[PDB]
Each structure stands twice: as C-alpha cells, then as structure tokens.
Design a binder for this molecule. Structure first.
Ligand SMILES: O=P(O)(O)C(O)(Cn1ccnc1)P(=O)(O)O
Ligand SMILES: O=P(O)(O)C(O)(Cn1ccnc1)P(=O)(O)O
Ligand SMILES: [Mg+2]
Ligand SMILES: [Mg+2]
Ligand SMILES: [Mg+2]
Ligand SMILES: [Mg+2]
Lengths: 283, 296
C-alpha cells in the first residue's frame, strides 16, 4: 500500500493547493498595504489587456525587489509600516520575494505567443534583472566593505544606471517591443537617475534619515567624501566615514553628519543643484 | 554643459559593468565553489546522458546551468536555515554578510537563465527549455516556502507524511526534474520524470535521516538546531498525537523551538525518536522500501 501511494505520487505533477499559495504569499501581500505606464502607453498603444499584464509584471518585480532590498538594508520601515521580514522573518520573505520574480517571469509568455517576439521579451527581462542585481551588488559592496572603496561620482552614476535604471528600462523596453506603432530609453535612464538621487537627497533633507544608519554611499555622501579628500580636509573626511560605520540610529549623531554636509561640504545644496540640472535637461 | 554632456553620454549607452565589478560581487558564490560534490552531480548528468544522448557540447552547458542553480539555491538555503557550516566550511553569509549573499545568489539564478539560450538557436525548443526552467524554479520556491513556513510558525501547522512528501516533491524534486526535463527536451535520441522524482524523495528523506543518525552514532544534528520538520520529526509528531503521548508531542515541539546547539538536548530528542516513537527505524525502513521500488 505504501508503494501504491508512492507510485501515484511520482507519476503526478507536484501537489500545490490554493491554500499553500496563500501561505507563501503572506510576505508579499503585506507590502501591498501605473500612471507612468499609462502615460507612456500614449506612445506605445499596447492594447489594454496586454498593458495589464506588463503592469502586473512590473508590480511583481518592483514589490519583490523592495522586500529583498529591505532585508539587504536592514530596514525597519517601508511606507511607514513594519517591513515584511520583521513580521514573517528573513527566510520566508527572501523565498517569497524570489518566488514572485519567477511568477513575474511566467506572466511574460502570456504577453505573446509569437516565437520571435517572445524570445526578445525574455531577453529584455533577463538582461534588466541581471542589471538590477549588478547595481544592487555594487551598492551593497561599497557599503559593507567601507572604507575599502570610496566611489567617485561617475562610479555612483554607473551603479545607478543598473540598480535603478534596470527596472525602468525593463518596463520601457517591454512596451517598445510589444508596441504596434526615437527610443525613450535615454529618457527613462535619466528618469531613473533623477529618481535615485532625489531618493538619497530627500532621505537626509526630510530628516529634520535611514541612509545614515544604513551607511550607504548616497549621492550627497559620495560628494562629501570626495570633496573632503580633494581639499585635504582629513579630519572631516574621517568623521563622515566614522559616522556611517557607526550604523547609528542616534538622531543627534545623524544631525551631526547632516551638518558636516550642510556647513563643511555643502553637499545638500550641491545635490539639490545636480537634480535641478537633470530635470532641466528634460525641460 | 560639461555635466550635461557627460550625462548625455551615460544615458545613451548600455550601463557600464567591469570584470573587476563582476569579480567583486561574485565573492559569495566563488566561496561555495570550494565545497566539493561537483563530480557526483556531473556523474548523474552523464549517466542520464547515456539514455538522452545529448552531444558533449550541449551537455556541458546543461551542467553549468544546473551547477549555478544548485549553488545559488544552497547559498540562499543556508541563509534561510541559519546554517553555520556547509561542507565543513564557514557559510558564505557569515563571511560576506546576508545582503551580498542574497544578491549574488539571485544574480546567479539570472545568469543561469541566460545560459539556456546557448543550448539551441531554434525558437520552438528554446521556448520549451525556458518554460521548464521557469516551472521547476517556481516548484523549488513552493517547496522551500512550506518547509520554511512550517518550521518558523511551528506549531501553527503539524505536517502529515503526505504533506511532507508533497513539499519534498517541490523542494528537492524541482531541481532533479529541471535537469532531467531539459535533457529529455534536448535529446535527439518512457519519461524518466517518475524515476528522478523517486530519486529526489529518497535523497531528501536520507539527508533528513543521516542528519540525526550520524550525530547519534558520532555529524551535528543541525536539523534539530534549525527546527526543520524533517521526515523523522513529522513521523514522531504524528505518532505521538495518534498514540496520545501528549507530553512527548509537546517536548518534541519545545526542543525544536529552542533552536538549540546543546548536544545533550539534541541527543535527548534523537533518543526519543529512537526508543519512544521509533521514528528512526520507521524512516530507515521507509527508505529501504523506496530503494527496493527501484532495485526491484
Ligand atoms: O535606497 P534604496 O536604493 O535601497 C531604494 O531606492 C530601493 N532601490 C533598490 C534599487 N533601486 C532603488 P529605497 O530607498 O526604497 O530602500
Ligand atoms: O535540509 P535542506 O532541505 O535545507 C538541504 O537538503 C538543501 N535543500 C534545499 C532544498 N532542497 C534541499 P541541506 O541539508 O543541504 O541544507
Ligand atoms: Mg533600501
Ligand atoms: Mg538598497
Ligand atoms: Mg539547508
Ligand atoms: Mg533548507
């Protein structure tokens, strides 16, 4: 009888239920608690149904990438709410995030069955996910190996072209390949750089600032470090490095670094200016 | 304008990635490569090839893909299981940190995916190979998802033997089937899926079993420390509940939830499976029976 039961088991597809699906989706639904795509669809005109799938794909990749990003950055909050890994644990959250990457991958074959186009859609998805990981890997490396390597502005920019530019290009490239109708890739790349630098800027600017606790080589920090190095302001250079290495939650210490950035290096205004220029390129 | 020029060149080009960059983020992965065991996984592919007859060329790429997926899944598994050691060596995440290890492992899943397109230039076939790849990685994550949920939310769910077996069909069967199905799909030459599923089940129950048996004889019985609903444990929990051994049932749950490294506590739990629930003999026997299904 044992053999009978085993025989039936190995000759069938693996058993997966609706209820199993729900257990596994808990970390993902918790982060659940588009107009950019619509707007762009005015140039691409994908039929509405197709656009729904592309959109579903983008939401999966995007949400899964944040679930893992929060474990990677040891983030306690996301949009004011407790992060999924603190509620469901790191194990379930990694696994669920990764599962949705592959679920997102499956939705791609439902965008088209035309064999030439399908290969292209998979190559786009694969290439940009590879880029998201390269950029994320460099961002993480710099932070965790600090002070081994202090990136320059140019190195930061290439990291961003991958870490943030990847999913922006993934959405845009899929729509341009599926479009019935110049590439807007350069534009979406620029959008990605502005979005990231503004993310870094705002994180400090609104502190009145988790990036400090995280110890990330943000755009303002990269400017401050290279400015102090260039001016041979040894003590200020080292004090910035010392605070980031503290992985501190102390607001008084966070404010202290913000002041080095405000008063010694003027990195905030410098970053403010940089963003305004990127934005002007478009205007 | 010099800035706008530089910005213009940046956004009108592919992103810049260097081999130095590539090396720097491959650290967690390169570390697990030192662990031995490759030859055997290769032997499996070779033996299977005697039936499939893939040219050596293609078989080589099938193997690179399987190795990348296997090592990447073990990097993540050790983070998930809080494992200190893998093949007598310190785990990548304890050395390079969880963030780099997760990112690197996931990066390697996408590099493996990329290799699939080196298996053929024919669009129909390519589409089936990518679907197999996609389906079985979805299966790997479904299985891991349950093993991990049962363990971390214990005692919310006490799996039965049947549930354990369905989770293993996904958790381990997934990569066994991935390898075989890519090969069957590539073969110029009945499906071996049922066989490879049995192989995976024997593989997993034996891994669960040896983990306790080696410690009871000499191993670390790290599955007790991890809290894993192993095959022996699932049997003991269901046996105790059925036989009315309330205290034993509860003590088994309590020891799993301590996440303990104390050797005597681990040995007390193993001797409970030995003498009180007889879960060890039951497992040895269950294994032997599955092995006879093949030998006979
Ligand atoms: O600062 P990060 O790069 O981690 C972030 O922008 C996420 N992210 C990840 C990749 N690109 C951006 P978030 O501030 O949302 O935590
Ligand atoms: O016990 P696990 O399932 O975690 C294991 O077998 C790995 N694994 C992961 C998925 N299937 C098997 P290992 O004992 O090598 O840690
Ligand atoms: Mg973050
Ligand atoms: Mg991050
Ligand atoms: Mg493990
Ligand atoms: Mg495991």
């Amino acid at each position: 009888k044992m053999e009978a039961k085993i025989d039936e088991l190995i000759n069938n597809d693996p058993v997966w239920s609706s209820q199993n699906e729900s257990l596994i989706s808990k970390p993902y639904n918790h982060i659940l608690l588009l107009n950019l795509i619509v707007q762009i669809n005015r140039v691409m005109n994908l039929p509405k149904d197709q656009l729904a799938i592309v959109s579903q794909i983008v939401e999966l990749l995007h949400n899964s990438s944040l679930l893992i990003d929060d474990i990677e950055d040891n983030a306690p909050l996301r949009r004011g709410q407790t992060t999924s890994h603190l509620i469901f644990g790191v194990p379930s959250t990694i696994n669920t995030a990764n599962y949705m990457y592959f679920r997102a991958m499956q939705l791609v074959s439902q965008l088209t069955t035309k064999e030439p186009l399908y290969h292209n859609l998979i190559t786009i998805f694969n290439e940009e996910l590879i880029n998201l990981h390269r950029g994320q890997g460099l961002d993480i490396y710099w932070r965790d190996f600090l002070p081994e390597i202090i990136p320059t502005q140019e190195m930061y920019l290439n990291m961003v072209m991958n870490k943030t530019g990847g999913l922006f290009r993934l959405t845009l490239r899929l729509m341009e390949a599926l479009s019935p109708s110049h590439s807007l890739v350069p534009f979406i790349n620029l959008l990605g750089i502005i979005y990231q630098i503004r993310d870094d800027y705002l994180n400090l600017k609104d502190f009145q600032a988790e990036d400090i606790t995280e110890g990330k080589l943000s755009f303002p920090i990269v400017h401050a470090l290279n400015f102090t190095k260039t001016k041979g302001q040894t003590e200020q250079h080292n004090e910035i490095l010392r605070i980031l290495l503290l992985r501190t939650s102390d607001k008084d210490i966070k404010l202290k670094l913000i002041q080095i950035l405000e008063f010694d290096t003027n990195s905030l205004a410098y970053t403010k200016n940089f963003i305004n220029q990127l934005v002007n390129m478009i205007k």
